[model samples]
Target: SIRIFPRIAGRSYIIYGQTSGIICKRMEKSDNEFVIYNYISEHYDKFLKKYVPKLYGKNNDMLLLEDLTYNYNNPNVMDVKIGARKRKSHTSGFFSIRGYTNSHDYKFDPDEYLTSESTINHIKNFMEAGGENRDKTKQVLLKWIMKLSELANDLFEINLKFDGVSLIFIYDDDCSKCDVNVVDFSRVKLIDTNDQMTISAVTNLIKILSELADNP
Candidate 1:
């Protein structure tokens, strides 16, 4: 049977075997991730101040991104990659649960497929934060996602395409605040007009998030 990355030997808020903060990632030249990060960091700060994270700097082959989990207390983060909606032939890659840190003790069991319910279960578990604070934490996340959908709506007017992007949500059992940030800009591209892949991602994610956000 196929395994999933050796089960994260004693999770320590480790990302790609990196530290708890300041994730240093190889900036693939073909992706122009550094360029896009610089562009957003320099100019889009004011407009996107409410949600998206800040890009610190670029050091040679690595790009530094502000760790959104730094401020929280043992943040339980989930990296849910967002993309154009797909048919139910098999997997649900777009909403599949990838990385999550439950007090740095997160574990993922192998699964064949994912459903909207599967997606929510993890989110509900993440937000539920074990037993308490689910209400306050979820309320905070809902507010942030409302702003996120606002950002999604504005994307329709621009010609940018987020080909490979992931929505990073953070919360903790001990913290009251929750956050949502977009990351993984390796396949980001710009065009002269709105593209279906980008539009589908936007509209579909907006739909999914709306359903997730407004659920009981």
Candidate 2:
């Protein structure tokens, strides 16, 4: 089934969307309501036409996509109820993109970048919560790394139905730092940054992601 993993309050949670074809989900959890408007103002093509009006109200907040229905050769329609929820909290929207090719040349703000010191801690906690011992923790981490590769690659090839995002997980070989960055996977054209300083790690990630796309 198609799924959307949107970032809410700095955590990734899977949510269902209105449409099944390459859904794009957006949410802003910050206290500043202006941030949400600013984002929509800048990317109205993506936010308004693609996600907002199609899922939730064009300018209001409410869960309305639940009533969405799709049929080939028939007009697509959505039912939106007004003023049911606060605009600044727990808001989500969905829209469809033409394909992965139409997603190039998109830029995102660092505020939307989910890579932070706190996110690293979350990944660490997530890994530790699944295992009992250090060795077990390492094993789980490996499995998770592979899984990340799988998900990343799936996003890359457009074969996997995504909500237009990619998650980046960073681990320190020296065990000094653990981190994760949730990126707009659709806007990411290359998995490798191609920087000599970070190329090794970037290469590994790209390799894993690419393998996931090619697997049977």
Candidate 3:
């Protein structure tokens, strides 16, 4: 989808639309996307507030969301993906990271950069750049991982499978605050039985965080 930021009455908003000539199930996909937003708002509001996109409304297949560009003052943002595999793969397992631009443009080669070592380094740099001392960095990193752990547990409790969660980390350059939001939900699934995927993902992230802390 090509997401455009539009201004009206001196206020900014995002208009997300699919590219022209793309053929697929529009209504079904749109409805499902809306439902996913609703689910997050209704069930995960506490865990996801200021991290996930706020759905304003929808018109047909197009969606209107809050413009996040101006939400944080002087923000340094990066996109991080947490999952075991690519969207097309079925059995891949691991936690990895990659960089992205403010426009959600991928900025790195996934195959080369999506490693635990590189992920840890990226996080470390981000933390240090925000003026975090070693202990403070460790605490911040642990807090973020803890939130992910809680999210995974919550998903498991609800019997929802969010196979892949894309996170956007936005650090305020003018303050000590940082926000991490889950920005994609198209792959969320509802399962009949309890699954361990979320738990496993959380474990991998925590393991990497532990290693980073020890080596820092």
Candidate 4:
């Protein structure tokens, strides 16, 4: 399993580790992970923003990265998994949002009201701290999905947390200013062929978010 831990001295850096398993297999896994991280940092930095953590260097299988929370002053953070749980077979990835108190912990409370029928209600009721209207927020997310679809050929099978995707929402005191970011990419895959599966996933998400916006 891959793990992340903050250094004790300060929040300047954190350690990302890919545990050693069966000899060569572990090294291969670590190498692949590093390669993907490096590729995203060098190539897709503009599109990803703070979601892409800065890699300082590596030690064996462990990588050093900048701690995102060190300077982040906002308290509201939400992580929503993109894509479907059963890829090529279903369409339900954009139906929910998980609320977290802290950025690092995986454990979270599921907000039942985040579903399709009540998406706007919840976003307005809960995510209002981020200060985005349903229309604007929905479009921003739709644009992201479309962009991902456009880059599908280059990033094949890149899992957008079929289980869930992380979205960080930062806001100012008035809740009129906000920022959103997508995090986590350890499971992303780079495939060789152009497949409809990737676009299908993005389309499904776009549809759901679009409905959420239109309904409200």
Candidate 5:
């Protein structure tokens, strides 16, 4: 077998090994990209985002991209894996955002939910303290979970929807786990609402793959 390089989606890092045997490594990644948009369309009924560029052409093994977003393209690009809906000439690249915007609420406090002033006061004490606040943080996390569970009870009431997403990892015996990851489209970020529909579509595709994994 020939030596192979494992590609990570987020960053660039070189691995050193004999390229002939198994290796143990820690790998964490998001396969949510491909199906995120699909999930939104089928389940969330929300918007789909677009970030990847379109493909222009391909010659046997070489791919030609129409508009390049990032500065990573090179002639040596080989063994590239294209996802669904990708055309031979203009396959769409996966979506990636530049920054995390404040479009939605990411944090919620549990103390505000308590009716009893004493409980709220007790928690507030630790939030004010510095190093001694670890316990309070833990309690806050637990309280948040509790609140989330309660909120979930009303999900159906508001017609909130969800679609399962799947991620595939490519690996070899020389490696501890798979390296290749695949996601469906709905998970993609839409450049404009006029372009994409929802994330649920992506999620549905992932759900299909997940079901297959479960059955097979």
Candidate 6:
């Protein structure tokens, strides 16, 4: 069966579902996203290899990709937009990104950086009881944070700039299984201060999620 996939937030693109469990997303930036996927496929596999979708092929701006939830039932998906420190001053080093879930299409946030606990909670709260158990949810988030750190580091070493890329985290209730995926590349370009700034964003997230995992 083919149909338009549910899109909650972020950019403008129409995602189509394929019967093979693979999906085809149409976007003006599809070509750039495809190249970034290829780069990640070539340079890293520690995370994207399993958690993220696989890009089977691409034709113009239409991409044939995997549906991360292919193996789940009524799963929840979260997109944490990383590498967003390109704004002025890079102090708080944060901004807004969004995400959603199946069975319950909700959740996503931003301004809300780690500079303050209240703001930090705002982001954490956005993850908002998505898991059946708070403890399990924190664990998944912690694992995700580590993977993101490595991903940011890889991009840093190569000086690749992801003006706005996101980490997609998915799981079913009861936390039987969970995964993290790096997605989006419309603005990625081989580029400076941008790398460190973006890395900084990843670093702060690690700090935040770590606390969430441990404290609870």
Best by lDDT: 6
lDDT digits (tens) for residues 1-216 of candidate 3: 444433211112334334332212233433665687787678767655644666656676655555454555566665555543444432224544545433223234444534455566555555545564666565656666666666666556555566565566665654456555665565676676544765665667667766775773
Per-candidate TM-score against the hidden true structure: 0.71, 0.26, 0.65, 0.50, 0.20, 0.76
Best by TM-score: 6
Per-residue CA lDDT of model 6 for 1-216, tens digit only, reads 557766545655556655557767775734677777777577655445654678788767788888877787756666666656345433244534454553133222333243565546544554654645776777677677777667666655554677777777676666667777766676777664347656666677677777777773
Q: By TM-score, highest first, what's the ranking?
A: 6, 1, 3, 4, 2, 5
**lDDT for each residue of candidate 2 in 119-188, tens digit (9 for 90 to 100):** 3333344333233446544643555455545433433322211223333333333333333333332222
lDDT score at residue 51, model 1, on the 0-100 scale: 48
Better of 2 and 4 by lDDT: 4
Q: Is candidate 1 or candidate 2 better by lDDT?
A: 1
Tens digits of per-residue lDDT, candidate 1, 128-154, equal: 563555456556656656766776666
Clashing pairs in 3: 51-181
Tell me the alpha-carbon RMSD of every candidate. Answer: 6.2, 17.0, 7.6, 8.9, 19.8, 4.0
Instruction: Quote model 5's TM-score.
Output: 0.20
Residue 131, model 1, lDDT:
50
Query: Against the correct fold, how does model 2 do in TM-score?
Result: 0.26
Q: lDDT values of the candidates? A: 0.57, 0.31, 0.54, 0.44, 0.27, 0.63
Model 2 pairs in collision: 50-95, 51-94, 166-185
Instruction: Give residue 41's lDDT in candidate 5 (0 to 100).
Output: 46
**lDDT (Cα, tens digit) per residue for candidate 4, span 65-153:** 54444444554544444533324322133434544334234332452333444444444444444455555555544554454444434
Model 3 whole-model lDDT (C-alpha atoms): 0.54
Point out where model 4 deviates above 4 Å: 1-32, 42-51, 59-62, 84-96, 101-114, 128-165, 193-216
Q: Poorest 10 consecutive residues of model 4 by lDDT?
A: 19-28
